[PDB]
């Protein structure tokens, strides 16, 4: 099923997805009420761009991506049983094409994703990453999705949470913010994180913050390879000798079968220590050098 | 040493302290640049109020409390070797006269203090409490300090942190925010919390959140009676079956040798669950009924 049509393709949450789909070799079309430098760039990359809203624009589409069900393109598709997918659902689908790193947890997804992208780029890898629903690739010279790697926040309040297919998954922590997504029941919310980590392939990797008592409780249920991290004495990957020099936080990272590595980050708080530990677990498992880790962490603001 | 003089006694951080000192039977004087309803109320309660700044106002004072060392009252005192105490230092001194509950921890001091005050007032006790450096007594009909109980935030960045003399102390968590107070060294910061809890009398009580990995690490060093709390399976006082009904969070509190008690609070997040657990530990140790606990927790916004 080769042809994908975006209604409102100039939206800031929509153009990135189309660009990645163009990069994967799909035929991509889109409509929007006005031409912009965004549609122009998508056309330069191979997208067919309509500047009206009319049923004829939906012709030939195998799937629609939308972010108004009375809109005539959507109706024409619905009446023709063409699948109509929400933007968030197609975003999560992109992870199947790449080596996906899913950053889950109630808090710290945004920073931990940016740090991972920061270190991987220091290692030459130019990853694509998703913050706030936007596809990104810091300083890239290429179409979104060029990199083998795709780092993304994985929000448990998101309808697509359990349809991510990552190779590696972080769980920073598990809070009760989104109980209402799960019937108002924190125990139902914990069971979803267990199911989420079981979307990993058996060769995948789950990166678990055992400083969180709720992460620590579900850890023995995870039939996937795991590395634990935190300040806890029993974490696989730990931070010790936390210190401050200026607006910068220093600490020593302990890692199994490695010498201790002094790192530093420009952001205060134990939570950014933990964001950096999670990043260090990912980077190490992937084979990235200490120089890239050290540089990636200290480069970020 | 009976007579205490406040320079700038109309300040919002200063009038409360003078009022408590009046309530303890001290002679209290003060100066300020302008008469206000605050100075008027202090005069109605027995304070002598000067409306100028001049050395003669400092005459007879045994101690000064200030919040400008060129000010003539301070100079007259300094030249006369009269002690000159910062406002924060005299605030912490008040705890010696009462049954002091010190709410320490990097995060959650404000909410946990207000919840404790909320439950104690539900129990008829009309406590005085300190948020943000301000003495408070919700709906009281009395001078500040009338109650036997004084609940106060205990900030580890505060110069007076280690001169609190509480009967009971909470440690919600231990973060690195204030490393710069302690030479930029988190390990120096942890040692201070250990020393702080040892300001408790041997019959005192330390209430420790063992969900915090740093609290959990120093726990075995505390030669004082301790009750631990959190979601951890091994906490003395735990929250289980967390659920949501509207904008309200429900959970069941487990307590040693007590039946489980369903409580609820109007604020979301596991952190307010923990604030409520800490409050429930304090209230229970003090002998307060379930009705006051339940009412105190659900009354607060
Ligand atoms: C607050 C918000 C802006 C955030 C959080 C954050 N990161 C993380 N927060 C947490 N839990 C924290 C609760 O907020 C605290 C932090 C201190 C140690 C005790 C737990 N655990 C984590 N593990 N790995 C990453 C990560 N970044 N930004
Ligand atoms: C954030 C800020 C506005 C705050 C914090 C707060 N209270 C507490 N926070 C913490 N740590 C938290 C880090 O913020 C998290 C919360 C979730 C479980 C994992 C730890 N532990 C606690 N123990 N007792 C009270 C209390 N109230 N408000």
XYZ file of C-alpha atoms and ligand atoms in Angstrom:
658
model
C 0.000 0.000 0.000
C 2.206 2.754 -1.424
C 0.372 6.160 -1.430
C -0.237 8.240 1.728
C -2.218 11.493 1.809
C -2.008 14.101 4.616
C -4.904 16.523 5.153
C -3.386 19.722 6.528
C 0.132 18.624 5.547
C 1.596 22.026 6.441
C 0.888 21.562 10.161
C 4.066 21.466 12.258
C 3.218 17.984 13.580
C 2.442 16.706 10.035
C 5.272 17.829 7.727
C 7.912 15.864 9.630
C 5.988 12.614 9.233
C 5.501 13.164 5.512
C 9.215 13.932 5.116
C 10.143 10.672 6.831
C 7.686 8.777 4.638
C 9.228 10.353 1.545
C 12.607 9.227 2.880
C 11.300 5.648 3.217
C 10.341 5.644 -0.481
C 6.567 6.028 -0.170
C 4.461 8.058 -2.534
C 3.235 11.005 -0.424
C 0.537 13.577 -1.166
C -0.966 16.347 0.929
C -3.452 19.200 0.973
C -3.401 22.493 2.824
C -5.241 25.778 2.677
C -2.100 27.772 1.844
C 1.270 27.176 0.239
C 4.211 27.720 2.586
C 7.964 27.132 2.607
C 7.042 23.837 4.308
C 4.877 22.549 1.459
C 7.462 23.891 -0.989
C 10.203 21.892 0.744
C 7.990 18.801 0.736
C 7.398 19.284 -2.987
C 11.145 19.654 -3.542
C 11.455 16.280 -1.796
C 8.821 14.517 -3.930
C 5.460 15.214 -2.256
C 2.449 16.129 -4.377
C 0.847 19.176 -2.748
C -2.725 20.386 -3.290
C -3.666 23.880 -2.129
C -7.408 23.241 -1.835
C -9.639 20.960 0.205
C -11.679 18.796 -2.182
C -12.524 15.111 -2.490
C -10.445 14.762 -5.687
C -7.284 15.311 -3.613
C -7.946 12.034 -1.803
C -8.073 10.074 -5.080
C -5.551 7.258 -5.249
C -4.610 7.468 -1.574
C -4.107 4.159 0.195
C -4.282 5.816 3.646
C -5.134 9.245 5.058
C -3.373 10.979 7.915
C -5.317 13.725 9.696
C -5.129 15.827 12.838
C -12.866 17.721 11.164
C -14.690 14.581 9.955
C -16.938 16.784 7.778
C -13.864 17.644 5.692
C -14.558 16.315 2.172
C -11.268 14.460 1.706
C -11.888 12.496 4.916
C -15.512 11.802 3.992
C -14.511 10.640 0.499
C -11.997 8.320 2.157
C -14.406 7.101 4.853
C -17.120 6.451 2.258
C -14.527 4.533 0.208
C -13.322 2.544 3.275
C -9.842 4.062 2.890
C -8.174 3.888 6.329
C -8.092 7.197 8.229
C -5.267 7.272 10.786
C -4.596 9.925 13.445
C -1.329 11.821 13.213
C -0.056 10.329 16.465
C -0.696 6.806 15.149
C 1.362 7.358 11.987
C 4.143 8.967 14.020
C 4.439 5.833 16.181
C 4.402 3.694 13.008
C 7.683 5.267 11.859
C 9.560 3.353 14.534
C 9.071 0.082 12.624
C 11.411 1.309 9.872
C 14.300 2.302 12.146
C 16.237 1.280 15.216
C 13.761 2.824 17.638
C 14.647 4.044 21.125
C 11.429 4.669 23.081
C 11.820 7.017 26.082
C 8.938 6.202 28.407
C 8.155 7.332 31.928
C 5.824 9.956 33.299
C 8.604 12.530 33.813
C 11.870 13.267 32.042
C 10.990 12.010 28.557
C 11.777 15.325 26.869
C 15.189 15.800 28.459
C 16.247 12.159 28.224
C 15.359 12.021 24.513
C 17.321 15.222 23.811
C 20.352 13.901 25.704
C 20.255 10.636 23.773
C 20.070 12.578 20.513
C 22.892 14.776 21.838
C 25.268 11.861 22.522
C 24.373 9.929 19.352
C 25.050 13.000 17.226
C 28.365 13.443 19.028
C 29.046 9.889 17.869
C 28.412 10.759 14.222
C 24.989 9.174 13.959
C 22.740 12.210 13.212
C 19.586 10.639 14.747
C 16.027 11.708 14.175
C 14.102 12.314 17.374
C 10.598 13.314 18.462
C 9.887 15.858 21.196
C 6.368 17.143 21.751
C 5.089 15.283 18.724
C 7.579 17.025 16.376
C 10.135 15.126 14.312
C 13.600 16.631 14.717
C 17.210 16.097 13.613
C 19.518 18.731 15.100
C 21.646 20.353 12.409
C 20.955 17.534 9.960
C 21.769 18.060 6.285
C 19.276 15.355 5.278
C 15.612 14.466 5.139
C 14.110 13.495 8.477
C 14.573 9.767 9.003
C 17.894 9.486 7.159
C 19.589 8.105 10.272
C 19.322 4.448 11.227
C 18.169 5.656 14.651
C 14.847 7.129 15.804
C 14.599 8.312 19.441
C 11.097 9.124 20.644
C 9.112 10.029 23.723
C 6.565 7.326 24.526
C 3.657 8.913 26.393
C 1.454 6.543 28.385
C -1.498 8.898 27.959
C -1.113 8.541 24.187
C -3.551 6.218 22.430
C -0.634 4.679 20.470
C 1.562 3.951 23.534
C 1.112 0.174 23.276
C 1.717 0.065 19.511
C 5.274 1.304 19.643
C 7.759 -1.244 18.307
C 11.082 -0.089 19.753
C 14.373 -1.951 19.940
C 15.233 -0.266 23.244
C 12.945 1.273 25.848
C 13.638 3.522 28.827
C 11.305 3.837 31.787
C 12.432 6.876 33.805
C 9.673 6.581 36.430
C 5.982 5.714 36.753
C 3.658 8.380 38.209
C -0.129 8.687 38.468
C -0.657 11.788 36.258
C -2.550 9.781 33.609
C -4.635 7.427 35.765
C -7.697 8.803 33.930
C -6.391 7.268 30.701
C -6.613 3.918 32.458
C -9.966 4.081 34.190
C -8.617 6.122 37.101
C -6.653 3.185 38.495
C -2.902 3.348 39.131
C -2.668 -0.463 39.152
C -4.146 -0.564 35.657
C -1.542 2.059 34.777
C 1.340 -0.103 36.064
C 0.113 -3.123 34.076
C 0.324 -1.043 30.891
C 4.034 -0.291 31.440
C 4.588 -4.027 31.837
C 2.813 -4.664 28.554
C 4.697 -1.807 26.902
C 8.127 -3.277 27.747
C 6.891 -6.589 26.384
C 6.549 -4.999 22.972
C 10.336 -5.282 22.912
C 11.770 -8.180 20.911
C 13.406 -10.828 23.054
C 16.797 -9.425 21.990
C 15.687 -5.902 22.861
C 16.733 -3.976 25.931
C 14.704 -2.382 28.748
C 16.429 0.441 30.651
C 14.788 0.749 34.093
C 15.236 3.402 36.772
C 15.237 1.358 39.993
C 15.255 4.554 42.077
C 11.567 4.755 41.229
C 9.753 2.414 43.632
C 7.114 1.631 41.028
C 9.674 0.782 38.336
C 11.475 -1.354 40.934
C 8.260 -3.238 41.719
C 7.500 -4.303 38.140
C 11.133 -5.052 37.223
C 10.892 -8.789 38.088
C 8.011 -9.124 35.592
C 10.038 -8.042 32.554
C 10.899 -11.094 30.442
C 13.327 -8.926 28.428
C 17.000 -8.044 28.898
C 17.300 -5.205 31.402
C 19.880 -2.722 32.614
C 18.912 -0.884 35.798
C 20.194 2.566 36.726
C 19.966 5.103 39.510
C 21.687 6.197 42.677
C 20.541 2.978 44.407
C 23.468 0.874 45.608
C 22.001 -2.051 43.612
C 21.666 -0.312 40.238
C 23.694 -1.801 37.396
C 24.672 1.702 36.216
C 25.141 4.197 39.069
C 26.117 7.804 39.688
C 28.496 8.382 42.597
C 30.375 11.367 44.023
C 27.910 13.963 42.774
C 29.462 17.435 42.912
C 28.948 20.906 41.487
C 31.367 23.210 39.625
C 29.553 26.427 38.648
C 26.241 25.908 36.822
C 27.521 22.415 35.982
C 26.963 19.093 37.761
C 29.743 16.490 37.900
C 29.457 12.829 38.759
C 31.212 9.507 38.250
C 29.298 6.815 36.333
C 29.858 3.212 37.333
C 29.196 0.608 34.625
C 29.678 -3.170 34.748
C 33.080 -4.256 33.377
C 34.070 -0.614 32.658
C 36.342 1.858 34.382
C 34.519 4.715 36.111
C 33.815 7.611 33.765
C 33.598 11.205 34.954
C 30.801 13.040 33.137
C 29.164 16.446 33.563
C 25.928 18.128 32.517
C 24.835 21.759 32.435
C 21.556 21.216 34.216
C 20.980 20.961 37.975
C 19.032 18.401 39.957
C 19.231 14.686 40.663
C 16.635 14.228 37.921
C 19.097 15.354 35.250
C 21.688 13.073 36.825
C 19.138 10.302 36.203
C 18.357 11.527 32.689
C 22.102 11.342 32.026
C 22.376 7.865 33.544
C 19.572 6.630 31.264
C 21.338 8.215 28.281
C 24.632 6.663 29.354
C 22.992 3.209 29.511
C 21.592 3.588 25.973
C 24.806 4.983 24.505
C 26.926 2.277 26.139
C 24.686 -0.578 25.022
C 24.826 0.801 21.479
C 28.651 0.866 21.437
C 29.284 4.607 21.600
C 32.660 5.783 22.910
C 33.287 7.666 26.133
C 34.331 10.746 24.164
C 30.938 10.976 22.459
C 29.162 10.329 25.767
C 31.238 12.951 27.574
C 30.909 15.422 24.713
C 27.234 14.716 24.111
C 26.348 15.287 27.756
C 28.362 18.447 28.271
C 27.267 20.003 24.999
C 23.596 20.134 25.870
C 21.712 23.171 27.202
C 17.247 38.410 78.829
C 13.709 39.780 78.535
C 13.521 42.636 75.932
C 13.645 42.059 72.148
C 13.675 44.847 69.551
C 12.773 44.384 65.850
C 14.085 46.866 63.269
C 11.487 47.010 60.502
C 8.892 45.251 62.673
C 6.135 45.851 60.112
C 7.746 43.521 57.556
C 5.576 40.493 56.760
C 8.324 38.092 57.889
C 8.873 40.074 61.141
C 5.452 40.783 62.686
C 4.637 37.097 63.137
C 7.805 36.492 65.140
C 7.151 39.475 67.389
C 3.572 38.290 67.959
C 4.805 34.860 69.031
C 7.356 36.461 71.346
C 4.618 38.589 72.896
C 2.641 35.374 73.369
C 5.614 33.793 75.182
C 5.640 36.686 77.677
C 8.670 38.608 76.405
C 8.908 42.361 76.359
C 8.889 43.271 72.643
C 9.691 46.571 70.939
C 9.989 47.530 67.290
C 10.637 50.371 64.875
C 9.320 50.999 61.390
C 9.168 53.881 58.967
C 5.356 53.964 58.936
C 2.499 52.970 61.202
C 0.258 50.261 59.758
C -2.581 48.019 60.916
C 0.214 45.513 61.632
C 2.077 47.737 64.090
C -1.280 48.785 65.542
C -2.198 45.140 66.161
C 1.214 44.517 67.716
C 0.681 47.517 69.988
C -2.758 46.193 70.941
C -0.945 42.991 71.934
C 1.702 44.718 74.083
C 4.514 45.719 71.702
C 6.125 49.141 72.016
C 6.268 50.610 68.506
C 8.532 53.453 67.359
C 7.797 55.146 64.037
C 11.313 56.485 63.452
C 14.762 54.993 62.983
C 17.061 56.358 65.703
C 19.565 54.903 68.152
C 17.329 55.740 71.147
C 14.843 53.100 69.944
C 17.435 50.402 70.622
C 17.841 51.496 74.261
C 17.119 48.739 76.751
C 16.999 45.987 74.136
C 18.623 42.708 75.111
C 18.659 41.483 71.479
C 17.936 42.931 68.036
C 16.187 41.158 65.195
C 16.801 42.531 61.698
C 16.243 41.576 58.078
C 21.408 47.649 56.433
C 24.266 47.584 58.978
C 24.575 51.385 58.653
C 21.129 51.677 60.260
C 21.640 53.572 63.543
C 19.727 51.164 65.786
C 21.914 48.275 64.597
C 25.103 50.317 64.960
C 24.117 51.432 68.472
C 23.535 47.769 69.307
C 26.735 46.540 67.631
C 28.788 49.236 69.374
C 27.156 48.178 72.663
C 27.799 44.446 71.980
C 24.038 43.795 72.004
C 23.455 40.612 69.963
C 22.114 41.201 66.439
C 20.250 38.149 65.122
C 18.908 37.575 61.597
C 15.167 37.147 61.218
C 15.541 33.540 60.090
C 17.579 32.730 63.211
C 14.913 34.063 65.588
C 12.200 32.241 63.643
C 13.992 28.912 64.175
C 14.436 29.791 67.872
C 10.653 29.770 68.375
C 10.613 25.996 68.070
C 12.274 25.640 71.491
C 9.116 26.945 73.188
C 6.675 24.564 71.492
C 6.218 21.006 70.330
C 8.019 21.550 67.038
C 7.396 19.518 63.890
C 10.184 20.222 61.380
C 9.302 19.395 57.745
C 12.615 18.874 55.976
C 13.440 17.613 52.510
C 14.353 19.381 49.309
C 10.834 19.095 47.843
C 7.356 19.015 49.339
C 7.994 21.023 52.512
C 5.304 23.598 51.746
C 2.544 21.106 50.997
C 3.449 18.667 53.765
C 3.481 21.457 56.371
C 0.074 22.732 55.208
C -1.397 19.219 55.329
C -0.072 18.682 58.843
C -1.585 21.999 59.913
C -4.778 20.951 58.108
C -5.149 17.657 60.011
C -4.091 19.084 63.392
C -6.657 21.863 63.080
C -9.276 19.263 62.177
C -8.293 17.667 65.482
C -8.971 20.857 67.437
C -5.361 21.862 67.941
C -5.171 25.202 66.033
C -1.414 24.907 65.275
C 0.903 27.683 64.245
C 2.882 26.913 61.115
C 5.537 28.540 58.932
C 5.422 28.554 55.133
C 7.834 30.697 53.149
C 9.207 32.266 56.298
C 5.748 33.523 57.396
C 4.135 32.503 60.676
C 0.560 31.338 60.130
C -2.423 29.932 62.042
C -5.373 29.284 59.727
C -8.540 30.881 61.078
C -7.052 31.233 64.554
C -8.773 33.516 67.059
C -5.532 33.903 69.031
C -2.046 35.343 68.941
C 0.405 33.377 66.826
C 2.013 30.694 68.972
C -1.013 30.058 71.198
C -1.078 26.392 70.188
C 1.195 23.837 71.820
C 2.270 22.870 68.295
C 4.548 24.629 65.796
C 4.924 23.053 62.323
C 7.697 24.496 60.180
C 9.548 24.004 56.930
C 13.216 23.240 57.571
C 15.240 24.390 54.564
C 18.701 22.864 54.195
C 19.891 25.966 52.347
C 18.955 28.028 55.408
C 21.799 29.094 57.690
C 19.723 28.027 60.736
C 18.899 24.508 59.441
C 21.130 22.769 61.997
C 19.886 24.857 64.937
C 16.311 23.673 64.782
C 15.239 21.848 67.940
C 12.178 19.879 66.833
C 10.405 17.041 68.604
C 9.529 15.404 65.280
C 11.215 15.732 61.898
C 10.125 14.711 58.408
C 12.541 14.138 55.555
C 10.487 13.970 52.341
C 13.498 13.486 50.040
C 17.093 14.651 49.593
C 17.996 16.383 46.306
C 21.064 18.302 45.119
C 19.473 21.762 44.596
C 21.515 23.312 47.435
C 24.903 21.630 46.961
C 26.383 25.152 46.755
C 25.387 25.729 50.383
C 27.635 22.803 51.240
C 30.724 23.460 49.167
C 29.175 22.034 45.999
C 29.311 18.472 47.313
C 26.224 16.254 47.534
C 27.958 13.968 50.052
C 28.510 16.937 52.352
C 24.820 17.677 51.831
C 23.772 14.159 52.910
C 25.906 14.369 56.069
C 24.008 17.514 57.077
C 20.639 15.706 56.968
C 22.147 13.056 59.232
C 23.263 15.733 61.665
C 19.895 17.473 61.402
C 17.945 14.358 62.467
C 20.367 13.999 65.359
C 19.131 17.296 66.735
C 16.093 15.261 67.761
C 15.936 14.203 71.410
C 16.357 10.482 71.920
C 12.586 10.255 72.494
C 11.918 12.239 69.329
C 10.715 10.797 66.058
C 12.200 10.887 62.540
C 9.731 10.370 59.676
C 11.673 9.129 56.622
C 10.521 8.655 53.036
C 12.232 5.399 52.022
C 11.040 5.837 48.424
C 13.846 8.368 48.135
C 17.054 6.395 47.529
C 19.110 8.984 49.380
C 16.829 8.965 52.433
C 16.948 5.154 52.313
C 20.756 5.203 52.293
C 21.178 7.318 55.434
C 18.323 5.656 57.355
C 20.595 3.103 59.111
C 22.650 5.997 60.541
C 19.767 7.565 62.475
C 20.144 6.782 66.185
C 16.593 8.093 66.750
C 13.173 6.429 66.606
C 12.014 6.248 62.993
C 8.855 5.558 61.035
C 9.407 5.010 57.314
C 6.785 5.707 54.658
C 6.280 5.441 50.928
C 4.954 3.124 48.270
C 7.904 0.755 48.868
C 6.771 -2.696 49.982
C 9.057 -2.306 53.034
C 7.748 1.046 54.287
C 6.206 1.033 57.755
C 3.368 3.288 56.536
C 2.315 2.600 52.930
C -0.195 3.742 50.332
C -1.864 0.969 48.337
C -4.645 0.777 45.748
C -4.158 4.304 44.446
C -7.182 5.392 42.409
C -8.806 8.543 41.076
C -12.388 9.836 41.438
C -12.701 13.208 39.671
C -10.052 15.779 40.642
C -9.535 13.706 43.801
C -7.014 10.951 44.554
C -7.995 7.983 46.735
C -5.725 5.500 48.436
C -5.622 3.067 51.342
C -3.063 3.763 54.091
C -1.500 0.791 55.829
C -0.200 1.420 59.361
C 1.332 -1.039 61.836
C -1.254 -2.479 64.259
C -4.075 -0.451 62.616
C -6.862 -1.327 60.227
C -6.417 0.081 56.721
C -7.785 3.604 56.393
C -9.170 4.970 53.138
C -8.140 8.605 52.676
C -8.402 11.079 49.800
C -6.764 14.347 48.784
C -7.702 17.005 46.246
C -4.309 17.194 44.613
C -2.907 14.890 41.919
C 0.435 13.136 41.736
C 2.295 10.476 43.684
C 4.121 13.317 45.434
C 0.929 14.451 47.164
C 0.246 10.825 48.049
C 3.649 10.953 49.773
C 2.944 14.332 51.369
C -0.236 12.766 52.761
C 1.612 9.673 53.980
C 4.102 11.879 55.856
C 1.195 13.828 57.366
C -0.551 10.585 58.291
C 2.600 9.360 60.083
C 2.835 12.589 62.118
C -0.869 12.710 62.954
C -0.931 9.044 63.976
C 2.152 9.290 66.179
C 0.591 12.310 67.890
C -2.651 10.440 68.683
C -5.038 12.128 66.258
C -8.181 10.232 65.248
C -8.978 8.878 61.805
C -11.823 11.375 61.451
C -9.459 14.332 61.829
C -6.950 12.707 59.466
C -9.632 11.961 56.878
C -11.208 15.390 57.281
C -7.902 17.240 57.406
C -6.682 15.634 54.193
C -9.856 16.067 52.181
C -10.416 19.632 53.319
C -7.226 20.993 51.827
C -6.904 22.794 48.479
C 10.649 16.973 37.317
C 10.723 16.856 35.782
C 11.003 18.223 35.118
C 11.792 15.884 35.344
C 12.041 14.593 35.746
C 13.186 14.170 34.989
N 13.741 12.884 35.106
C 13.605 11.852 36.002
N 12.888 11.973 37.109
C 12.788 10.927 37.977
N 12.049 11.167 39.054
C 12.109 12.493 39.682
C 10.649 13.016 39.826
O 10.420 14.137 38.951
C 12.941 12.472 41.003
C 14.287 13.220 40.807
C 15.242 13.140 42.017
C 15.536 11.679 42.411
C 14.196 10.973 42.738
C 13.213 11.036 41.539
N 13.354 9.723 37.840
C 14.072 9.616 36.719
N 14.773 8.544 36.293
N 15.409 8.807 35.070
C 15.090 10.029 34.760
C 14.252 10.623 35.751
N 13.601 15.126 34.173
N 12.722 16.195 34.396
C 7.616 18.288 42.824
C 7.290 19.184 44.034
C 6.224 20.249 43.685
C 6.794 18.381 45.212
C 7.323 17.263 45.813
C 6.420 16.939 46.882
N 6.629 15.856 47.752
C 7.453 14.757 47.743
N 8.225 14.466 46.707
C 9.021 13.359 46.736
N 9.744 13.166 45.639
C 9.156 13.475 44.330
C 10.144 14.416 43.577
O 9.584 15.735 43.435
C 8.748 12.182 43.556
C 7.203 12.052 43.495
C 6.699 10.736 42.867
C 7.274 9.504 43.595
C 8.821 9.569 43.534
C 9.359 10.883 44.160
N 9.126 12.483 47.740
C 8.344 12.790 48.777
N 8.209 12.108 49.934
N 7.286 12.732 50.787
C 6.871 13.786 50.149
C 7.480 13.899 48.863
N 5.417 17.802 46.940
N 5.660 18.705 45.896
